[PDB]
Symmetry: C3
Subunit: 178 residues, 3 copies
């Protein structure tokens, strides 16, 4: 319901995506099929693009915003790219960062400017992934700053895709009730 | 303004409870007398039940959601249960966990799946109570993950109930406008 | 949209300030010129005043609330006071605190009761500035609790004002559409 234009850029949302009325999608946003956006989530693509893939969960009160960078006298803007089968947890912040496929950004965590969360990895709850930091494949990072705790079990990795499916099926049932 | 059905289940909100119109309540929610829910708070009972008791405050941008837990084949859904006289702080997350009576969940903190905040305890600000962890009676926990800092002094415990009453009174004044 | 009145007192918002429809402003709030408030932000001046200066940014899902401090008998209510050219970051909490001029409160951080963020200082992401804690002029604090990390370089301080202007200009373009 709050699908807002900005500078004549309107969100492109796939017809099988679900955006809850209490989420806020602004500007140059792209959302793929079966991707869900939940109450209070703000996806604000005003200063640069936000691209979200298919079958991804943007959980409640999560904020997604491109970065404005001031290390050069000319101001620079970094887009957000989020891949497929991801869980962006309750109250997580994705700030000018890249999330690849089948990964979990834990609840309340921050993934900051030019960072990259690689496929089949986890950002731990409340963790802060710093500027340009890389979360490696098959690992979980925790704390502030985010540091590697351990490798993920092969079951833990396989249940990410299963979580993405569960939450996409949930979103489908929301869609059926206007 | 956003009390929403889900799969036939409607939020059962007591008449003396206050839900700010900018809060979001969905599905199988039970909210008791004098309990307040503040702007941006999301209480989403779609995958399981959320039960909140009486005189409890769910402060701004707090999120309450049942847990989906993934066993070898079955998916376990874990309901949220929050008791009486609690302060769920600004931007806190209660996720498939249990809060008992007269406790403070501090601002920005997380109480995770299957965790338990016992009566007369505190989760400190920004702390993360990991799954199946108990915050014991009469104690504060801090940091990530949450670990015991010290005992709550006798005065500190009595001011929890007093704070809950102050916030329930504040909500009463919101209801009249 | 949600500029709510409380107990007779209505938000006093300058004509050049910008409040996004999805922000919530309640009660005894004072907002200076060129200041911007963004989706999901809550500025709730109900138990005491909140004063925000000019050219300041209250980013998405940020919460500003006065403090209720509990003494042996009486209850003290502490106002929020936020100065000029500040950045209150995505999902930050300013709770009964004082923020002076040209500072950054980092994303997801807490500035709690009777605390003070001095001019040209910086609260790190996910940090928790405790009760009555000062964030000193020229310095950056991090972690839980908030510990001084280092002095800010002269270039970094110069970019605080520039970031405030960039976001004030952004808000200007939002206000020209609706
Ligand atoms: Na189906
Ligand atoms: Na009364
Ligand atoms: Na201009
Ligand atoms: Zn931003
Ligand atoms: Zn959840
Ligand atoms: Zn408060």
């Amino acid at each position: 319901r709050m699908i807002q234009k900005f500078e004549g850029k309107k969100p492109e949302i796939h017809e099988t995506a679900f955006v809850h009325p209490r989420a806020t999608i602004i500007g140059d946003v792209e959302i793929g099929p079966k991707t869900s956006v939940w109450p209070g989530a703000v996806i604000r693509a005003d200063i640069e693009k936000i691209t979200i893939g298919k079958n991804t969960c943007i959980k409640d009160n999560a904020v997604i915003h491109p970065a404005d960078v001031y290390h050069e006298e000319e101001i620079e803007y970094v887009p957000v790219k989020i891949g497929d089968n991801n869980i962006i947890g309750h109250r997580a912040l994705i700030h000018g960062a890249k999330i690849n496929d089948e990964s979990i950004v834990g609840a309340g965590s921050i993934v900051f400017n030019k960072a990259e969360v690689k496929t089949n990895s986890m950002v731990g709850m409340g963790a802060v992934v710093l500027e340009k930091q890389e979360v490696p494949n098959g690992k979980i990072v925790v704390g502030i700053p985010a540091r590697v705790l351990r490798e993920l079990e092969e079951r833990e990795i396989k249940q990410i895709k299963k979580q993405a499916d569960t939450h996409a099926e949930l979103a489908e049932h929301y869609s059926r009730e206007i």
